[PDB]
Symmetry: C2
Amino acid sequence: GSMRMKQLEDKVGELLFSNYWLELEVARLKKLV
Amino acid sequence: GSMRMKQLEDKVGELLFSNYWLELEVARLKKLV
């Protein structure tokens, strides 16, 4: 129905992915400092 | 307006801000190790 909505849905998924990996990186760094 | 579109936009905005916050935190921590 809505290609606009698909694009935003996709971006939510991409950002959830990126944020997961950034959180993991922060946690690894907290174990290192 | 569209509740679905605005909810998507809102979630993208929140995730983008968190992403940026996390990148700043990674950079802060990387300076130390």
